[PDB]
Amino acid sequence: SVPSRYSLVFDADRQVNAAAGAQPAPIKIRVLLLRSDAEFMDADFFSLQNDAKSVLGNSLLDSDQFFLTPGQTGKKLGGQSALDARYIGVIAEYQNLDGKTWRISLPLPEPTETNFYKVWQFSPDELEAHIVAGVSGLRPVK
């Protein structure tokens, strides 16, 4: 709500998501709007994949998804935030889950940090982050 929307721009490594002996394969990315990330960071992969709302309950505000092709750069997904949104959760459904960072939680700013809007009323109100789906997992870019 303040700011009102968000977006994530995704790059995927050319070698992302290639099993032993197999070619790199598109990977499913989910983006979840969250009231809190506690249940999200604790839930097991299957639970989140098969029924996120059940395992997350009231903590899940919204969710969206897309596929990312190995080597693809600058693929953007965004949506509207909500007043009580505190985190964006990101899940990457790697075929070989072991040792991969297949989930990340990104904290949204709190009241303090978006204070500038009452005075700077016309500043852009879309938060943007950049994520890479890498061979070892998801990581934000500096």
Numbering used by the authors: 32 to 173
From the paper:
Lip is a membrane-bound lipoprotein and a core component of the type VI secretion system found in Gram-negative bacteria. Genetic studies indicate that in S. marcescens this lipoprotein (SmLip) makes an essential contribution to the basic function of the T6SS and to T6SS-dependent antibacterial killing activity. The protein fold is dominated by an eight-stranded β-sandwich and identifies SmLip as a new member of the transthyretin family of proteins. The pro­pensity to self-associate using parts of the SmLip structure that will be exposed in the periplasm suggests that this protein, exploiting the lipid anchor, helps to bind and position different components of the secretion apparatus at the outer mem­brane.
The structure of a Lip construct (residues 29–176) from Serratia marcescens (SmLip) has been determined at 1.92 Å resolution. The structure is that of the globular domain lacking only the lipoprotein signal peptide and the lipidated N-terminus of the mature protein. We now report the high-resolution structure of SmLip determined following phase determination using single-wavelength anomalous dispersion (SAD) measurements based on the scattering properties of iodide ions. The refinement proceeded with the release of NCS restraints and the incorporation of water molecules, an Na+ ion, ethylene glycol and a number of side chains with dual rotamer conformations. This data set was derived from crystals grown in the presence of chloride instead of iodide. However, we did not assign any chloride ions to the structure, noting that typical water molecules occupy the previously identified iodide-binding sites. Molecule A consists of residues 32–173; molecule B of residues 33–142 and 147–176; molecule C of residues 34–50, 53–143 and 147–175; and molecule D of residues 33–50 and 55–175. The asymmetric unit of SmLip is a tetramer with 222 symmetry, but the assembly is distinct from that previously noted for the transthyretin protein family. The accessible surface area (ASA) of the SmLip polypeptide averages out at approximately 8350 Å2; the range is from 8200 Å2 for molecule D to 8510 Å2 for molecule A. Each molecule in the asymmetric unit interacts with two of the other three and two types of protein–protein interface are formed between molecules A–B and C–D (interface I) and between molecules A–C and B–D (interface II). The type II interface covers about 6.5% of the ASA of a molecule, a level typical of the values observed simply owing to molecular packing in a crystal lattice. This interface is formed by the antiparallel alignment of two β4 strands.
